[PDB]
Amino acid sequence: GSDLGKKLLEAARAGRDDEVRILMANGADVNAADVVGWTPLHLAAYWGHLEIVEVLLKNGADVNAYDTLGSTPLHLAAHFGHLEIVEVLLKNGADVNAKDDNGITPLHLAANRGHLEIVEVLLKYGADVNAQDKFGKTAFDISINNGNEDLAEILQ
Amino acid sequence: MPNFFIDRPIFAWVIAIIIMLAGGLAILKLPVAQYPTIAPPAVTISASYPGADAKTVQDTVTQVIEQNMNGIDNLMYMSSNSDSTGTVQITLTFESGTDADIAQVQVQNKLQLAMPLLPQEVQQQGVSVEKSSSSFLMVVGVINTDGTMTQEDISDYVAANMKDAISRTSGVGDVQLFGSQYAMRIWMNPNELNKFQLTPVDVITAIKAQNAQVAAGQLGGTPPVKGQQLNASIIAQTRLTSTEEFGKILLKVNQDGSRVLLRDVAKIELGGENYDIIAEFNGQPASGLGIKLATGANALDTAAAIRAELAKMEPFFPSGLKIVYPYDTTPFVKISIHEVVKTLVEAIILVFLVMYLFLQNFRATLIPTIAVPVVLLGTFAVLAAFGFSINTLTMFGMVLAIGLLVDDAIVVVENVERVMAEEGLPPKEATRKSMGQIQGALVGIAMVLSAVFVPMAFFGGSTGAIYRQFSITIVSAMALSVLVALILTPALCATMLKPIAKGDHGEGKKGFFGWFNRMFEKSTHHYTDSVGGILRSTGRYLVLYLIIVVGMAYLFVRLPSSFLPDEDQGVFMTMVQLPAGATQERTQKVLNEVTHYYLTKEKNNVESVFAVNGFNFAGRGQNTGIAFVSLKDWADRPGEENKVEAITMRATRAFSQIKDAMVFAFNLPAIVELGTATGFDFELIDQAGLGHEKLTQARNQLLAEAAKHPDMLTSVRPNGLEDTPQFKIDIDQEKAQALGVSINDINTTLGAAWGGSYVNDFIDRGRVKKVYVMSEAKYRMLPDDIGDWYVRAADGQMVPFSAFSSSRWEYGSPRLERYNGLPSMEILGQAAPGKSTGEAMELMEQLASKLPTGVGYDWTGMSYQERLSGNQAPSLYAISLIVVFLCLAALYESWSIPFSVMLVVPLGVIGALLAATFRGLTNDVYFQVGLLTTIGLSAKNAILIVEFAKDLMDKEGKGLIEATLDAVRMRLRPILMTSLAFILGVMPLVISTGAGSGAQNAVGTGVMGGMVTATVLAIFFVPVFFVVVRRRF
Amino acid sequence: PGADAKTVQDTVTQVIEQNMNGIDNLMYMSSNSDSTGTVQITLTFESGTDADIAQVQVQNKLQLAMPLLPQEVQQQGVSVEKSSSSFLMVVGVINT
Ligand SMILES: CCCCCCCCCCCCO[C@@H]1O[C@H](CO)[C@@H](O[C@H]2O[C@H](CO)[C@@H](O)[C@H](O)[C@H]2O)[C@H](O)[C@H]1O
Ligand SMILES: CCCCCCCCCCCCO[C@@H]1O[C@H](CO)[C@@H](O[C@H]2O[C@H](CO)[C@@H](O)[C@H](O)[C@H]2O)[C@H](O)[C@H]1O
Ligand SMILES: CCCCCCCCCCCCO[C@@H]1O[C@H](CO)[C@@H](O[C@H]2O[C@H](CO)[C@@H](O)[C@H](O)[C@H]2O)[C@H](O)[C@H]1O
């Protein structure tokens, strides 16, 4: 929503660590969203750029910020398997039980793609294992349907 | 042989006449086009999968086709792009010299076979296979000025009335429509569809049922009951013809007795096949005709006929329809012909003036005036013999050769005039002696000149084809010229020339000519004395000579090489590129500005701007665009500030002020193909199944690591588009089955409403057009709209998409490249200031090796051709040298003497190099072809000085120095003349502005400088050369 | 199949013919459309024309037409070949 805002959006999704630093020095927006409601935090989370996420979070970026479809950066991180980014977000205040418009939590997505390490971490930060999507499925359900034996053990 | 025709001038006249007759004939039956075919044969397969994403297209269509492209002959490479608009193109590119017809049929025969492997909706749309030719003869724009016609309305009209006639017109090979004909459009309304429990599926079923072609049979058909008196055809239901009918299509009979019509749940109108591309011409709606010349045709004739046909159409146009002509190569090509007939006429005139000045004789003024056209005539014939076209390249190949044509006439005649004026012989016995003095050298010259040009025909690929035009034109012109000078001129001299009595050097004559005759006869002595002095001290000049060779070498290196020089072509483009997710609305906002600039801030130079939204040289899409800007005549745009290259940077600057767009402008290249010298074309390749994300990454790495060498690599860039947000909708199979909803009903509802669907055909006013079902736009814009669509479940209950789907944002590709079968990413860039391309390439190659495992790379396009076909330039010129030496050695009966002549070469080159580098020009093709002709003449001039000199020694028993002086004295005059005539001859081209200027400049300014130096230097250096060589051995 | 002459022309003959222009050495082009549902389009080439190359070129242009043609006409197949029109002979077969 500004010359630098958009510029920052570009920089975060490509992970130009330095250009981010500068824009950060310059006061570029941390709430600059594109047409789908993604902020540079989302972009950095989806694309796995740890330094940026840490940087943006220091500069007051919204960690529970949410796309036009209800999805917070934690979702994107959990789903796309970036352990380190998940830990940071969580440690920095992220909602672990955030439900997108479909009722899908970050636990759900990690479960589906079978990133167990991410699951434990989310479990450790107290993710509701019993929470269910619009279709009424738990992350355990996701696991048995996908036939992940190891993952279903954890989710008990 | 010259003595044969000296006693038989009738025979010579016959031969002469026969040459002219063939030539005149061949001038008529010879094709005219701008450039001949240069690019090696390419064939493009194109299909469209209505409503598909780049991956869907690639994975259901592109791969299947690529997978079936085997057994085809003479492939070099195969590239394909699959994009977000539903379209794939696959380009197979064949070896140079492959029959394009054969290549095209082979490609299509394989596609045919692969066809049943493609989705329904794609075989239904078909997949077209064409030749790749980025050469339009012209583009006819068709606009509506009184605003009563949408671009669809225009397009349809153009199709229904204008297109077929233009197709049938003489000389036109292919015609392309810049729009689509009408299409029956059913614009669904999901709200209505719900109150009557209807899905898109019923709407489609109804349409296939009621808009159809039913076979019946015959009354009284065979075998009949005998005694049958009548046989008639039974004619059943036929195709629908109107919107009224389509709207009367019956969907449902409600239980209460009510009727549900297609128009009850839809809006129905004649519309377009697709709406991806918005064409505007100076802000008004627009359509067009992209027209291409046919094989062996004549651009000029064809263009004329195209215009005359549109004329015949004018009376019937609806209100405010108008033809305009935003692209026409034809006025251009006209200029090129005019300018080269001029140059060939001017030169005869210059030669007449010179011939008369020095020789002071009218009967002699005629000999070259006959011989030169006769040679130019028969040249045309031999050009037709190998079936070349009158084109930009062969025409300039003539002007370049004009010097040698002129020379051979000048030479043969002058030497007869000299022999009389020195010995008091009769014309007949004089020519017999004079021809006897030069005949062997002439045969020799024809060989030596062959070995200079003929090698150039042998270069490979695109460039080779270009050289080949010049190489062949110039070898034939040369060889006729030598034949003529051995058959015609000898006879013409012997029978046309006024006697001269011994010693009469016209020194005792009138005013101007007596004074000239003495000022010249004197300057001949100064010259003589100069060479005598020069010969007393040869070391001084072997040193001077080594300096010019170094200068030549140094100059050469520091001269930028190009292919063909840019040209104000009457038009130029400008690219706009909004970012990811930008609507076509927004793109039009920019385009209207770009149009605004050119119409306001360049009222002077711009006649029109054709704005095309949705299309772009990097890709297709709602967020791309291109604007074709057409300029007023060159006569209305004078002075470098009003030529294309100015307007370019000025417009590029103003557009850098555009907030959220990437807008620049640029001029088209000469020949539409070869891109950039110093420029390269790179393919990054997935050789191990890594996928998109990993490949984008290897690309990123290679780009970033190339940006860290701005001294070799400059402007290294991706050719394709970047990933963009996508809307991923997941169907819940479980809940679908549990509610009694079908998968196919769900999916067909999604895709038909949101993507469109080609149902079948109908007939509109006698023409067969398509029928499309889609949602009215206001129900297919935003994600919230998805659940506004209802699908019927087996139990007859209406269920909203919101109940069995889930949606999320995720990034994916809107354009996916492949190269020789595998996923790829195209990379462009050029060599940095002053570096070669093979250097920049070698670094890219080196830099690429350090990429992640599984990533490979290939060189395509011009780079492919370089990596295999530039290395010949030495090897070929080594052959030249060897043959040249060999011929000379044969000529002079000496392994040693040839060096005396060969040494002349840099004397020509240095001026040319000075002259180019001066002006700020380049080492482009014209320049190089000009070098060869410069070198040719000087080599010739030399060959004669040496031969005469040597002759005097061997025959009259003269000393080395005595003969070199005498030779150089004799050979002084005809060298001055030829040069004098030629330097003037090329002067017009040297100073030309606009209108095919850039070309004329290139051929001219490098011939001028080179002729200056090769004349001055050779009259001093050649005598030295002979003497030192004869001394050393 | 089953289509009248006007239909067979509007939906097939026209479509093909309008894609049939711009071919090397094409003197003239006759065609007809009967009531069985049959289209026959004949292109005649300047004497000297390589017949096999001529065929290929027509093959190539016909491709561009194929998809625009009705579904059921492509289902029948559409052939492209050098042709004659004169019977060299008629071999008769009878039973004695
Ligand atoms: C009337 C007399 C005048 C006649 C003059 C014309 C004759 C010219 C001969 C045509 C040459 C054809 O071009 C052909 O190209 C290949 C290129 O892969 C050359 O092959 C080359 O391979 C490597 C390439 O890395 C070169 O370094 C090498 O110098 C060369 O041998 C051939 O040597 C040549 O024969
Ligand atoms: C064709 C168009 C342009 C015309 C003029 C352009 C400029 C070039 C002029 C010609 C140069 C040669 O001019 C000639 O040079 C030699 C020197 O090497 C001179 O010769 C003299 O100098 C040398 C040494 O210094 C002596 O060994 C020699 O014995 C002596 O006579 C000649 O007296 C002079 O006539
Ligand atoms: C009496 C014998 C006569 C023999 C003398 C030799 C002739 C010299 C002049 C003609 C030059 C021919 O052309 C020579 O090779 C190529 C031709 O594409 C030119 O330009 C360039 O072409 C290729 C391909 O695009 C590039 O890879 C290369 O970097 C570059 O050399 C050069 O500018 C020129 O040096």
Side-chain angles (χ1 to χ4, degrees):
Chain A
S2 291
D3 201 26
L4 293 163
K6 315 310 230 316
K7 276 268 189 59
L8 179 58
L9 279 165
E10 311 251 6
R13 74 137 283 186
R16 295 187 295 265
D17 295 320
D18 225 271
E19 196 199 354
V20 177
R21 165 196 66 91
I22 291 147
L23 281 133
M24 282 296 93
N26 289 115
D29 200 15
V30 283
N31 259 29
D34 63 16
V35 218
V36 314
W38 280 25
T39 67
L41 192 44
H42 289 92
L43 277 320
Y46 177 96
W47 287 98
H49 292 132
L50 185 55
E51 237 285 87
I52 281 112
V53 176
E54 263 164 337
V55 161
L56 290 178
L57 276 160
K58 297 198 233 85
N59 285 76
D62 191 7
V63 60
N64 294 359
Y66 59 148
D67 54 25
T68 72
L69 257 28
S71 167
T72 54
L74 178 53
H75 284 98
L76 294 143
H79 184 167
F80 267 65
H82 302 125
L83 190 65
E84 38 272 327
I85 297 194
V86 176
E87 297 226 45
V88 170
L89 297 154
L90 277 164
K91 131 198 165 208
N92 267 99
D95 188 337
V96 67
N97 295 286
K99 297 221 238 193
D100 72 20
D101 309 344
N102 317 306
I104 293 171
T105 74
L107 180 62
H108 279 120
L109 302 158
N112 197 306
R113 292 278 207 268
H115 299 301
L116 6 62
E117 357 219 344
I118 312 278
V119 174
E120 284 169 355
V121 175
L122 292 163
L123 278 185
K124 167 162 276 178
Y125 285 79
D128 188 6
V129 68
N130 281 0
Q132 52 189 318
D133 66 36
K134 54 177 302 152
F135 306 129
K137 300 321 201 64
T138 74
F140 171 67
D141 284 317
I142 315 303
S143 71
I144 57 181
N145 202 261
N146 294 8
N148 202 328
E149 299 182 68
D150 310 57
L151 163 62
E153 158 145 356
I154 315 177
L155 301 161
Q156 296 143 19
Chain B
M1 185 160 180
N3 258 264
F4 179 85
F5 292 96
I6 243 116
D7 291 322
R8 300 158 187 74
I10 302 313
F11 203 155
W13 266 122
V14 172
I15 297 180
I17 288 171
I18 291 173
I19 304 223
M20 314 188 62
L21 258 347
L25 164 52
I27 287 174
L28 301 183
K29 273 193 178 60
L30 216 32
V32 179
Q34 194 167 19
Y35 303 104
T37 85
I38 298 308
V43 174
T44 299
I45 315 196
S46 348
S48 56
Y49 190 161
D53 45 283
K55 217 197 184 312
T56 298
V57 174
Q58 184 190 251
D59 291 348
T60 79
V61 184
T62 316
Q63 292 220 50
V64 177
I65 300 172
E66 271 176 342
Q67 269 190 46
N68 276 275
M69 281 305 120
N70 325 273
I72 305 168
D73 284 310
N74 302 331
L75 245 200
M76 289 196 314
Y77 56 83
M78 153 170 85
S79 75
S80 64
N81 49 291
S82 317
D83 63 48
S84 247
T85 46
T87 111
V88 43
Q89 287 198 321
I90 307 184
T91 297
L92 312 94
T93 318
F94 300 79
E95 312 275 8
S96 256
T98 297
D99 195 292
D101 285 312
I102 303 282
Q104 194 194 322
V105 77
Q106 301 202 330
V107 162
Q108 161 213 344
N109 282 344
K110 297 302 173 170
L111 209 219
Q112 224 198 86
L113 290 176
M115 283 291 323
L117 309 193
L118 307 160
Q120 266 303 130
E121 30 275 317
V122 161
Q123 32 209 15
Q124 181 164 329
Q125 272 267 344
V127 186
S128 44
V129 174
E130 343 209 20
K131 278 176 256 180
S132 288
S133 171
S134 52
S135 51
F136 282 154
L137 185 60
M138 45 178 296
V139 169
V140 182
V142 175
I143 98 274
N144 171 259
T145 67
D146 54 357
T148 52
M149 293 174 76
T150 71
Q151 70 145 122
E152 288 91 34
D153 298 10
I154 310 280
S155 298
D156 183 72
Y157 187 95
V158 178
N161 304 85
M162 309 182 45
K163 183 181 161 301
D164 303 330
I166 297 312
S167 289
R168 285 188 264 104
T169 299
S170 188
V172 13
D174 210 73
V175 168
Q176 179 188 327
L177 186 65
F178 296 156
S180 55
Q181 60 182 9
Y182 276 146
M184 187 60 49
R185 300 315 234 98
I186 315 298
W187 300 109
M188 288 175 306
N189 172 337
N191 287 331
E192 306 291 1
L193 281 178
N194 187 43
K195 71 179 293 182
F196 312 118
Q197 299 71 67
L198 288 160
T199 90
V201 172
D202 303 294
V203 173
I204 286 177
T205 293
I207 287 164
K208 295 213 215 167
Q210 310 187 222
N211 180 42
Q213 175 65 26
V214 181
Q218 320 169 34
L219 287 175
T222 71
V225 179
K226 294 284 167 61
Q228 183 73 355
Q229 289 306 321
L230 182 62
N231 180 213
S233 277
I234 308 191
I235 287 316
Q237 167 193 336
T238 60
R239 263 146 175 180
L240 261 59
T241 40
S242 70
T243 78
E244 282 73 16
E245 284 165 6
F246 264 98
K248 284 189 183 106
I249 289 177
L250 192 239
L251 291 171
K252 212 199 197 205
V253 197
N254 278 114
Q255 351 296 331
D256 106 82
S258 283
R259 310 174 62 218
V260 177
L261 291 323
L262 182 46
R263 66 158 186 256
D264 285 320
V265 296
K267 291 183 180 191
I268 291 142
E269 76 181 37
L270 266 326
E273 300 203 349
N274 73 42
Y275 290 87
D276 276 325
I277 295 197
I278 292 194
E280 263 172 6
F281 179 85
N282 287 13
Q284 284 147 330
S287 178
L289 287 177
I291 306 178
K292 314 189 183 179
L293 228 223
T295 293
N298 181 303
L300 298 169
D301 293 335
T302 298
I306 292 182
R307 279 191 161 85
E309 274 284 337
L310 300 164
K312 305 176 77 172
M313 278 165 221
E314 189 81 44
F316 317 85
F317 290 169
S319 62
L321 212 89
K322 182 162 73 178
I323 308 306
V324 317
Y325 302 88
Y327 180 90
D328 195 349
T329 68
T330 251
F332 210 109
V333 180
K334 199 188 62 171
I335 268 68
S336 311
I337 316 261
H338 163 21
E339 291 292 334
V340 177
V341 125
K342 157 192 283 191
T343 285
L344 294 172
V345 161
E346 276 173 341
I348 311 288
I349 280 149
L350 294 180
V351 163
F352 168 89
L353 282 0
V354 167
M355 278 288 288
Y356 179 57
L357 207 184
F358 288 72
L359 282 172
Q360 303 160 15
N361 189 342
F362 274 122
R363 270 183 147 198
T365 226
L366 293 197
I367 313 284
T369 317
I370 284 168
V372 176
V374 156
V375 177
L376 274 156
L377 243 33
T379 287
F380 279 111
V382 182
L383 262 257
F386 298 173
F388 282 63
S389 36
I390 278 128
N391 63 75
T392 300
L393 305 189
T394 47
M395 278 189 325
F396 272 138
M398 260 150 174
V399 5
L400 287 175
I402 209 38
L404 303 89
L405 291 216
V406 149
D407 191 81
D408 290 47
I410 289 190
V411 167
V412 166
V413 172
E414 184 273 354
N415 196 64
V416 174
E417 292 283 57
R418 193 187 50 68
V419 172
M420 300 194 292
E422 286 191 8
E423 281 188 87
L425 292 199
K428 206 179 66 177
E429 7 261 278
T431 55
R432 288 193 204 161
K433 192 172 193 205
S434 165
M435 288 313 301
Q437 289 173 356
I438 58 174
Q439 66 190 24
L442 280 163
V443 157
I445 287 149
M447 309 282 91
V448 167
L449 286 173
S450 285
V452 175
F453 300 96
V454 177
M456 190 183 33
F458 282 83
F459 278 92
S462 283
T463 41
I466 295 213
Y467 289 105
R468 207 180 116 259
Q469 290 303 272
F470 296 97
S471 181
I472 277 301
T473 302
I474 299 201
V475 166
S476 313
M478 211 290 305
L480 268 94
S481 165
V482 181
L483 245 342
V484 165
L486 276 157
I487 308 179
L488 187 59
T489 57
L492 293 203
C493 282
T495 71
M496 280 183 67
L497 238 44
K498 306 173 181 170
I500 314 284
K502 186 159 161 283
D504 173 25
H505 290 86
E507 294 205 61
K509 217 172 182 171
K510 41 207 275 90
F512 202 6
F513 296 174
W515 167 93
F516 180 82
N517 263 9
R518 293 183 287 274
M519 165 271 202
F520 184 67
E521 265 291 331
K522 194 177 191 173
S523 315
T524 298
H525 288 88
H526 281 74
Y527 169 65
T528 278
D529 298 355
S530 266
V531 176
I534 288 194
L535 290 180
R536 266 174 243 127
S537 61
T538 66
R540 217 168 311 281
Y541 292 116
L542 294 202
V543 162
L544 232 305
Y545 178 82
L546 245 85
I547 294 169
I548 312 172
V549 168
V550 169
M552 181 194 73
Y554 161 74
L555 250 342
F556 208 147
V557 175
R558 275 204 167 197
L559 190 69
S561 40
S562 179
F563 274 148
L564 288 182
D566 258 27
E567 293 263 23
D568 186 286
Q569 235 151 333
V571 299
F572 72 132
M573 269 161 308
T574 155
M575 188 159 309
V576 359
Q577 252 257 51
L578 292 264
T583 58
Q584 105 178 331
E585 184 155 33
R586 284 158 71 193
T587 290
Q588 204 62 16
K589 273 76 269 275
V590 174
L591 276 171
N592 292 134
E593 278 202 45
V594 177
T595 274
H596 193 60
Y597 169 97
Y598 295 115
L599 296 194
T600 303
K601 311 255 176 181
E602 302 265 8
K603 177 181 178 167
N604 254 26
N605 315 282
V606 156
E607 185 138 305
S608 77
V609 53
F610 211 136
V612 189
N613 175 330
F615 178 54
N616 188 250
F617 284 163
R620 309 178 37 96
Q622 219 173 110
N623 69 353
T624 80
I626 206 104
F628 221 94
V629 193
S630 326
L631 309 174
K632 329 205 66 140
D633 314 53
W634 298 255
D636 295 37
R637 306 179 289 112
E640 199 170 292
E641 4 152 4
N642 279 13
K643 269 62 188 171
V644 162
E645 189 179 52
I647 314 175
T648 291
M649 48 152 243
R650 289 207 312 269
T652 311
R653 277 206 310 257
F655 295 159
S656 57
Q657 266 315 102
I658 299 312
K659 281 252 71 175
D660 267 30
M662 213 288 122
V663 182
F664 56 84
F666 60 109
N667 186 16
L668 357 171
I671 283 190
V672 171
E673 282 63 31
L674 267 158
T676 52
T678 70
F680 58 72
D681 201 350
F682 185 91
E683 295 295 339
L684 201 64
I685 288 155
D686 183 357
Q687 320 251 17
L690 313 167
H692 194 62
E693 245 98 326
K694 282 189 171 40
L695 232 211
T696 76
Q697 289 180 5
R699 187 200 71 184
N700 288 352
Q701 181 185 331
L702 178 59
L703 288 178
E705 270 281 325
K708 304 187 324 191
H709 290 71
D711 49 307
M712 274 279 193
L713 280 15
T714 185
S715 227
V716 50
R717 54 197 181 285
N719 209 135
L721 306 189
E722 293 304 306
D723 291 22
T724 67
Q726 307 179 319
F727 184 81
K728 177 69 167 223
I729 188 170
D730 268 313
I731 310 295
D732 195 50
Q733 297 302 323
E734 172 151 8
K735 178 85 170 167
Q737 303 190 19
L739 292 162
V741 185
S742 172
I743 345 288
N744 301 101
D745 261 42
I746 279 164
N747 281 337
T748 295
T749 287
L750 181 65
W754 287 81
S757 192
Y758 181 5
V759 181
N760 49 39
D761 296 347
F762 80 112
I763 331 233
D764 184 53
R765 298 175 273 110
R767 298 181 65 92
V768 64
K769 306 169 182 150
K770 297 181 183 156
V771 181
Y772 277 103
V773 175
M774 194 179 325
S775 172
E776 193 178 351
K778 31 132 95 171
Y779 311 94
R780 54 163 181 90
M781 293 290 99
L782 299 184
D784 203 31
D785 298 325
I786 289 285
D788 258 335
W789 291 90
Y790 283 58
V791 163
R792 205 196 323 110
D795 78 330
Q797 275 212 112
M798 253 27 221
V799 171
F801 246 73
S802 66
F804 49 75
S805 42
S806 61
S807 44
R808 90 185 115 95
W809 296 109
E810 129 206 307
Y811 277 66
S813 173
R815 178 147 176 294
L816 294 148
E817 331 187 353
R818 310 183 61 94
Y819 185 88
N820 272 87
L822 316 132
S824 69
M825 251 139 179
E826 187 180 9
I827 285 167
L828 298 186
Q830 49 234 33
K835 299 314 121 193
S836 95
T837 330
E839 297 196 43
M841 255 185 253
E842 175 173 321
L843 177 54
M844 289 285 308
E845 282 192 22
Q846 199 214 93
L847 264 167
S849 84
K850 293 301 199 73
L851 293 174
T853 67
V855 167
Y857 77 90
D858 216 332
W859 288 120
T860 191
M862 42 176 163
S863 300
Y864 181 100
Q865 300 194 309
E866 234 253 310
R867 190 197 53 173
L868 289 84
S869 308
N871 44 312
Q872 303 165 303
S875 353
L876 286 173
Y877 284 143
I879 313 302
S880 260
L881 240 271
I882 300 178
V883 180
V884 168
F885 169 88
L886 247 349
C887 283
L888 262 3
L891 171 59
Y892 294 136
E893 193 65 23
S894 172
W895 296 116
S896 357
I897 299 226
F899 299 126
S900 47
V901 161
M902 266 175 281
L903 283 179
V904 74
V905 169
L907 283 55
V909 197
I910 184 79
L913 291 175
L914 249 347
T917 313
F918 179 165
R919 185 79 101 84
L921 266 17
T922 23
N923 185 7
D924 56 38
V925 166
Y926 294 129
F927 173 83
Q928 307 161 18
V929 188
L931 273 188
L932 267 76
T933 40
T934 317
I935 279 157
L937 245 171
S938 50
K940 202 174 182 289
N941 285 339
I943 286 158
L944 289 166
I945 294 160
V946 173
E947 176 61 271
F948 270 23
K950 177 153 195 312
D951 211 78
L952 277 165
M953 294 192 57
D954 292 316
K955 281 297 102 217
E956 299 211 42
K958 300 191 158 187
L960 200 169
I961 304 298
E962 185 180 3
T964 300
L965 267 326
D966 205 27
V968 121
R969 184 190 52 80
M970 278 178 289
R971 300 305 313 153
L972 199 261
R973 181 162 77 170
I975 290 175
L976 260 305
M977 301 192 274
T978 291
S979 284
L980 212 173
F982 200 26
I983 329 293
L984 296 185
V986 326
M987 283 198 333
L989 319 189
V990 191
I991 73 194
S992 166
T993 62
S997 59
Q1000 311 182 48
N1001 288 346
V1003 11
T1005 79
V1007 155
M1008 207 191 196
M1011 278 300 308
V1012 165
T1013 62
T1015 314
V1016 170
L1017 310 189
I1019 59 177
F1020 303 113
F1021 277 98
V1022 175
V1024 166
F1025 289 165
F1026 186 56
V1027 180
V1028 41
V1029 180
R1030 291 258 49 182
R1031 268 168 179 175
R1032 171 60 157 96
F1033 313 90
Chain C
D4 49 289
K6 173 126 200 82
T7 285
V8 159
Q9 177 186 250
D10 288 349
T11 65
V12 177
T13 318
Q14 203 90 286
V15 185
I16 309 184
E17 265 195 338
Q18 67 192 18
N19 284 134
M20 209 46 54
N21 302 119
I23 302 192
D24 294 338
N25 316 102
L26 202 228
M27 278 171 326
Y28 51 85
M29 181 189 55
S30 28
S31 59
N32 55 76
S33 317
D34 69 28
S35 42
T36 82
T38 278
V39 179
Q40 269 197 333
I41 306 190
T42 305
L43 304 119
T44 318
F45 294 86
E46 263 126 37
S47 274
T49 289
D50 185 345
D52 297 323
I53 281 310
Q55 182 278 334
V56 166
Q57 312 204 357
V58 173
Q59 249 246 254
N60 283 332
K61 286 295 187 65
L62 174 67
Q63 206 273 318
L64 278 310
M66 286 298 327
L68 301 144
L69 297 190
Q71 176 80 221
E72 343 197 61
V73 181
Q74 345 205 15
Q75 288 301 319
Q76 234 54 44
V78 13
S79 104
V80 168
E81 31 193 337
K82 315 188 295 177
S83 56
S84 282
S85 57
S86 154
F87 294 97
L88 168 72
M89 65 178 76
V90 174
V91 175
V93 176
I94 41 111
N95 177 218
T96 86

